[PDB]
Amino acid sequence: MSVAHGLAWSYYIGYLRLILPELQARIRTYNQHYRGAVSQRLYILLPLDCGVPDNLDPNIRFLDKLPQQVYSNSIYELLENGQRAGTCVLEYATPLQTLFAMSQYSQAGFSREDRLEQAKLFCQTLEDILADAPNCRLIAYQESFSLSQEVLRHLR
Amino acid sequence: MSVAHGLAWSYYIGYLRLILPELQARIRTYNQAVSQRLYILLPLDCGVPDNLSMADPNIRFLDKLPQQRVYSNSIYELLENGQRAGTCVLEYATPLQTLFAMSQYSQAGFSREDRLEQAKLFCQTLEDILADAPENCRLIAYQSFSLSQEVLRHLRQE
Ligand SMILES: CCn1nc(C)cc1C(=O)/N=c1\n(C)c2cc(C(N)=O)ccc2n1C/C(C)=C(\C)Cn1/c(=N/C(=O)c2cc(C)nn2CC)n(C)c2cc(C(N)=O)cc(OCc3cccc(OC)c3)c21
């Protein structure tokens, strides 16, 4: 019954439930067609400070788009000690942009303290929705800091 | 900090604030009449059908609103006494689909009574965001029934 609950349900109903059923087959088509294979599962970055940059760290490099289906998903390499240590489909949780905007607009009556509480609640709520819906993994973190090491810990 | 508050802000930040600044130029290009506002249908029961061009016999698809993301918007004629009584850009408020889904799934802990309360609060919150937003968008909230008469009542106020 919070801001976070509506955002988690909208993100699941309006996006994840529509793209997750076909993701495994798209990754497989990419790996079969074309060092190291693209890991299965969609990795969602959840910066709890709600700082979502315009273009997804020196050790996270874009490689290619995945074959569509009107969904654009990107494959990245993760570097460790300067070399490729993993490859995966990665993307930011867009509802955290709305939490950031609500903290910025006075009309929302939503403080930066409310924002962090709702970001944590969004992560927990989304985790619980996905646990009850049998190809996805949430990477929550609060930002020196290495995002590549954060993703690599989940991949391994 | 209610469910409605987050849905109204996501719908504004992630859709309306991006589409509304170019709406007047798109309507002007088609007219050069179609009303100057985006009319958003808000069925408070949260029943959003798959196709608006088949929702009412007196709401007929006229044309796609041209370009001046690439947004797809539709222009409809509203009939009264079998004749064109108004023309406007019309579409359903998609966040009401999430309110419907939350009432359907036990995990959400969200009753049909909560759904209607949040649907009304979503309408109020969105109207207040749009009233103060930068200087073209009207909300049509409603619960035999004529949807064309509902839209025409709003159009005739403008
Ligand atoms: C919606 C689920 N969701 N809930 C929360 C919380 C956050 C998210 C979320 O972030 N959603 C998405 N992600 C991460 C996505 C990633 C990918 C990918 N991998 O490529 C692809 C799609 C993705 N979507 C779906 C989006 C962005 C829409 C459907 C936007 N949209 C929209 N929105 C609303 O209903 C809504 C309700 C609430 C509440 N808040 N909103 C605003 C978001 N309406 C009416 C739209 C109408 C039109 C029109 N008139 O034709 C067009 C739209 O968008 C054309 C478009 C085209 C291409 C790229 C593009 O942007 C990528 C957008 C409309």
Residue numbers in the entry:
A (entry chain A): 153 to 186, 191 to 212, 216 to 228, 239 to 303, 308 to 316, 322 to 334
B (entry chain B): 153 to 184, 193 to 228, 238 to 304, 308 to 315, 322 to 336
The authors write:
In this work, we use an orthosteric STING activator and inhibitor from the same chemical series to discover that STING M271 is a critical residue for molecular activation.
However, the differences between the two structures are unexpectedly modest with a r.m.s.d. of 0.548 Å2 for all atoms. In contrast, diABZI-i demonstrates expected inhibition in the WT THP-1 cGAMP stimulation model (IC50 = 3 ± 2 μM) but potent agonism in the V155M SAVI model (EC50 = 17 ± 7 nM) with a > 170x increase in potency relative to inhibition potency in WT THP-1s.
